[PDB]
Design a protein around this ligand. Sequence first.
Ligand SMILES: N=C(N)N[C@@H]1CCCCNC(=O)[C@H](CCCCN)NC(=O)[C@H](CCCCN)NC(=O)Cc2cccc(c2)CNC(=O)CNC1=O
Lengths: 38, 159
Amino acid sequence: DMYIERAGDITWEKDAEVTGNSPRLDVALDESGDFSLV
Amino acid sequence: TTDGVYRVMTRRLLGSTQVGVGVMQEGVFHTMWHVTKGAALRSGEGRLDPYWGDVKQDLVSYCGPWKLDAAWDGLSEVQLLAVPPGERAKNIQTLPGIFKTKDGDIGAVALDYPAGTSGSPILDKCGRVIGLYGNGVVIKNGSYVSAITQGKREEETPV
Ligand SMILES: N=C(N)N[C@@H]1CCCCNC(=O)[C@H](CCCCN)NC(=O)[C@H](CCCCN)NC(=O)Cc2cccc(c2)CNC(=O)CNC1=O
């Protein structure tokens, strides 16, 4: 039994918490949908 | 099929497990292929049948074709509307990095959430869904970077 349950509206939050860097990565995508680092 | 973000749950004999997340828009449910493995979904007393999908993109839509057409503009911050298992939906803002591929650049977010957060929407400042979270790579120190995965909204199919 795989089922869905609503979890909210989709909105941009003003004054949201910011985090994370912005990495630049060389990757390959294969025919099965896997990303790998080169 | 009211618009919004939804958890994707599985139930066997015991309790339920959240295996992912998806977006309902224009009567179509959008999630990542690895969440459902492209199988049917229940919504209330109704059945949602797979309609379009692509395992390489790791995407699947239910009840109709892929509807989400907004794109990252390549320089603005974005928000992940993370819907983690057992936790309230929350917005996290970030400046994407880049997956550089032989076929072009893909925006990518260095945000690390449980596996069942897969399919959570990534948003632009207008609240448009510019992709879904959860197909990515693990970099050297063990942290995670997700592609901003977006499908193509095709033109109306002839008749
Ligand atoms: N810090 C981590 N590792 N964080 C993730 C965030 C998932 C976010 C949601 N997305 C996924 O669940 C996908 C599913 C597979 C899609 C394949 N098309 N997965 C991934 O995109 C990566 C891909 C690796 C590259 C494939 N060439 N797979 C993993 O990360 C597997 C992994 C690896 C090491 C350790 C762990 C898991 C243990 N960590 C957890 O148990 C919870 N955290 C995560 O699992």
